[PDB]
Amino acid sequence: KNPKSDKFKVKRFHHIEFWCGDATNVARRFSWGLGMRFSAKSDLSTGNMVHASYLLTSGDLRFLFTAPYSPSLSAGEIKPTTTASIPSFDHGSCRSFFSSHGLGVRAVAIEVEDAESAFSISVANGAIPSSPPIVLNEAVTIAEVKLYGDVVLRYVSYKAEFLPGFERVEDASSFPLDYGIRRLDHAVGNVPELGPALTYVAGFTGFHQFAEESGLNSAVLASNDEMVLLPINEPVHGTKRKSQIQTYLEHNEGAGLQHLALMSEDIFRTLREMRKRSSIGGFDFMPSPPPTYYQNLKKRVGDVLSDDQIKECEELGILVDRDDQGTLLQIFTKPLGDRPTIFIEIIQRVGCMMYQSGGCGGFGKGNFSELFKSIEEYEK
Amino acid sequence: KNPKSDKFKVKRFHHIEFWCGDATNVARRFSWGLGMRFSAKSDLSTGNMVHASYLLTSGDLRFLFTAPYSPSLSAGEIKPTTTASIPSFDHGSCRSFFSSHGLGVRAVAIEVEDAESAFSISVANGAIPSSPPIVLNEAVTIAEVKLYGDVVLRYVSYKAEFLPGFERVEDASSFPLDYGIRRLDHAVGNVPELGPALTYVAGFTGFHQFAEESGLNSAVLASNDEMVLLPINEPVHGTKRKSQIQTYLEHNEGAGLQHLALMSEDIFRTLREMRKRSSIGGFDFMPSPPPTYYQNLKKRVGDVLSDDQIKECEELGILVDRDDQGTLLQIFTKPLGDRPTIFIEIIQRVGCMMYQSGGCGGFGKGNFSELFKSIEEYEK
Ligand SMILES: Cc1c(C(=O)C2=C(O)CCCC2=O)ccc2c1C(=O)N(Cc1ccc(C(F)(F)F)cc1)CC(=O)N2C
Ligand SMILES: Cc1c(C(=O)C2=C(O)CCCC2=O)ccc2c1C(=O)N(Cc1ccc(C(F)(F)F)cc1)CC(=O)N2C
Ligand SMILES: [Co+2]
Ligand SMILES: [Co+2]
C-alpha cells in the first residue's frame, strides 16, 4: 500500500555530495573507476576562494566532490560577501566531518518543487535544520536538514549549469567516459537504532514505508511515486558472525551513509568495464559467490534469465534476487576509501513495466540467505 | 667543486611519504596516472589500527601514502604497544598537517648507513629533532629531523618488505603498470627565506652547494656523490608577474615541498603514457611552449637531439636545457591536488658518463629565459 503522504512535492534524486580531504584526487579516481565524466567545477579558477568542488555525471547520476581550501584565502569574507558557490559550506564543519568519519557522503540531495517550502514544512514537522533556504542568483534554491549522523538531506529547486557559480568543464579535461550508469536508485543509512531514525525521517517528509538472522534489520522510506528510496539499517547484536552494520558504526564514528546504489542500463557492460579497471585505479568488488550460487539461479530465475545470461552473471560475480513484482541484478564494491564504511552497489531491475516503477524487485534481502546457503552447499 | 663534507654516510633517496585524508583514493589515482604498481601495505588487514599506508613503486621510486584512522580504534594503545608500522606517526600531527597544507609530502626519506648515528650527528649539528631513532623488528632503524616547514628528512637504515609490519601486496591487486619512471632525481622545497634554510640544512647534513628576474632565487644542496639533491627556492617579490613561489607559500600556509622530479629511462614513453591518461584519472601537464621554442631547440641542442627527437619533444611538450656537462629533458605537471602547491617534474638526463653523475645538465633554470623569449617571439 502507498498512501502518497509526502508533505511536499518531491521529484527525483538530484546529486550526492562527498566531503573530501582532497577533492581532485577523489574525483579523478571515481571518474575512472565508475565511468563518470567531469561536467562542472567551482574552485579557484572560477573565483571560489572557499572550497573546491568538482561534479562528475553519468546519465542523470551526479556525484559532487568538495574539499576546503585554507581558511586564510577567504578570511576577509563574510556570508553576505562569500565566494563559496555552496552557501551551506563551512570549513570547520567539513574538516570535523572528515576527521570524524573519513571520506563519505555529506549530502543526499533531492530535487523538489520549492526548496524553501520543503524546508519550512520539514522543520515544522520535526526536521532538525542544518542550513536555511538560500536563493542562488535568483535561479536555484538550496536548503538542508539533518538526515542521520552528520548526513544532511539537501533540497534543491529550480525556477526554470548544476548550480550558479559552477562552470561547465573545458572539453579537453571532459573525457566522455561512460560504463552505463544512469541514475541513483537508492541511498542507504546505517544507524544504531532503526525505530527512532525511521520515525524522524518519515515524520518530517511524509515518506511512507516501502513494501518488503545475519547482521541487520532494515526498512525503506519512499516518496509518493517511490522514485526517491531511502533504506535505513540497524545492527542485530550478539550474532554468530559480527554485524557489518556494527562494524560500520565503529569505523565511521557513528551513523552515516552506508551505500549508494547506482542503476545501470546494462549491468553486464558496467561490470565488465569496472572490473577491467579494478587494479588500475578503479574499484574492487566483494568476493564472488561460489558456483553453487549460480547453479541455484536456474531454479530461482530461469524464467527471467537465459542460461547464457546466467553464465554472464557468473563471469561477473553478479547477484540476483526476485520480488513478486520483478527481478534485481546487483553487485557490491569493496569500501570506496580507507575505512570499511561506505561502498557502492551497481543494480539493474527487470519487470514492473507500466516506465518502470521504483524499487522493482526489492533490495536483495533474499541474497543474505541465498549466499549463506550457496557457500554451505559449496563446502559440500 | 665538491668538498665531500657529508657528516654521515648517505646512500640514496629511499621513499617519499604523502600525508593524505584518504590514502586509498590518492594512491589509486597516483598509481594510474604515473604507472606505479601497488607493492606493499600496512592497514587494518595487516593489524594496523592506527594508520593506513600504501606503497607504490616504479623501479627504485617509492611513493608512500598514509592517512589516519579514527583514533578510537587505537585508543587503548600506548607507544610501547602500538600497532602502527611507522612509529613516528601521530593522528593529531597528520590531521593538523593536512588541514594546514592540504595533500602533500610529509617525509623525504633517504637511506643512510646508520639512522641512529645520522640522527645523533644531525641534531648535534643543529637539526631540530622530529622523531627519535626507533628500531623496527631488529631490522630497520628510522629517525626524523625537521627539513623545512612541516616536512621532515627521514633517515632509514637496514641491517641487511619496505618496512617491518608492511605486507607484500596480493598479485591480483598488484597490476604491473610501468610508464618508465625509475627513481627520484631531486626534491625541492619552497621557503620564505633561502639563506636561513640553506644554512640550517647544510649545517646539520654537511651537504654542499651543487654547482649551477622571474620568480625565485634557488640553490641546491648535494650529498657526497651528488645523488641526493635537495634544491630550495625563495620568492623574489615585487616582480612583473607574481612569483609562483609566493603563490605556493600563500596556498600552502608556508614552507613545504614544491616538486618531486622523477627520472625516466625513456621520457618519450613516460609522457606518451601519462598524457593518454590525463583526462581519464591521471595527471595534467602545464601548457606547452609555443612552436618557436622548438624551432629554437635546433640551435641549442641540435648536436644532442636529432630533428626527429626534437619533433618528438614538440609533440609531447617536453622542455630542454643544457649544462656545460650535459643536457636535461624535463616537463611539469599541473598541481597534484586541489591547491596550487605541489607538482611533479618528469626528467631524463643525457651526458656525464663515467654510470651517470648526479644532476647532469642542471635543473632547467635556463628554461625560464628560454620560455619567456620563445613566447615573445611567438607573439611575433
Ligand atoms: C548492503 C547489502 C544489500 C542492500 O543493498 C540493502 C538495501 O539496499 C536495503 C535493505 C538492506 C540492505 O542490506 C543487499 C544484499 C547484501 C548487502 C551486503 O552488504 N552484503 C555485505 C557487504 C559487507 C561489507 C561491504 C564493504 F566491505 F564494502 F563495506 C560491502 C557489502 C553482503 C551480502 O552478502 N548481500 C547479499
Ligand atoms: C620548478 C621549475 C624548475 C625546477 O625544476 C627547479 C629546480 O629543480 C631547482 C632550481 C629551481 C627550479 O625552479 C625548472 C624550470 C621551470 C619550473 C617551473 O616551475 N615553472 C613554473 C610552474 C608554475 C606552477 C606549477 C603548478 F601549477 F603546478 F604549481 C608548475 C610549474 C615554470 C617554467 O616555465 N620552468 C621553465
Ligand atoms: Co542496496
Ligand atoms: Co626540478
PDB file of C-alpha atoms and ligand atoms in Angstrom, chain B residues 185-188 231 258-262 328 330 332 343 345 347 349 362-364, ligand 4:
ATOM      1  CA  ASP B 185      66.139  12.634  -9.043  1.00  0.00           C
ATOM      2  CA  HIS B 186      65.549  15.582  -6.702  1.00  0.00           C
ATOM      3  CA  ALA B 187      63.066  17.002  -4.198  1.00  0.00           C
ATOM      4  CA  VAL B 188      62.557  20.751  -3.948  1.00  0.00           C
ATOM      5  CA  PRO B 231      67.087  22.313  -4.158  1.00  0.00           C
ATOM      6  CA  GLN B 258      57.305  22.256  -4.101  1.00  0.00           C
ATOM      7  CA  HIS B 259      58.037  19.474  -6.563  1.00  0.00           C
ATOM      8  CA  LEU B 260      59.364  15.953  -6.953  1.00  0.00           C
ATOM      9  CA  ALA B 261      61.491  15.292 -10.033  1.00  0.00           C
ATOM     10  CA  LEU B 262      61.149  11.712 -11.261  1.00  0.00           C
ATOM     11  CA  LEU B 328      68.231  17.855 -19.478  1.00  0.00           C
ATOM     12  CA  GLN B 330      62.026  17.957 -18.419  1.00  0.00           C
ATOM     13  CA  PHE B 332      55.986  19.692 -15.328  1.00  0.00           C
ATOM     14  CA  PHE B 343      53.524  19.332  -8.639  1.00  0.00           C
ATOM     15  CA  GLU B 345      58.516  17.012 -12.806  1.00  0.00           C
ATOM     16  CA  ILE B 347      63.117  14.299 -16.294  1.00  0.00           C
ATOM     17  CA  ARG B 349      69.430  13.423 -18.420  1.00  0.00           C
ATOM     18  CA  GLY B 362      71.331  21.012 -14.158  1.00  0.00           C
ATOM     19  CA  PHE B 363      67.748  21.790 -13.142  1.00  0.00           C
ATOM     20  CA  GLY B 364      66.374  23.714 -16.123  1.00  0.00           C
TER      21      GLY B 364
HETATM   22 CO    CO C   4      63.296  20.399 -10.789  1.00  0.00          CO
END
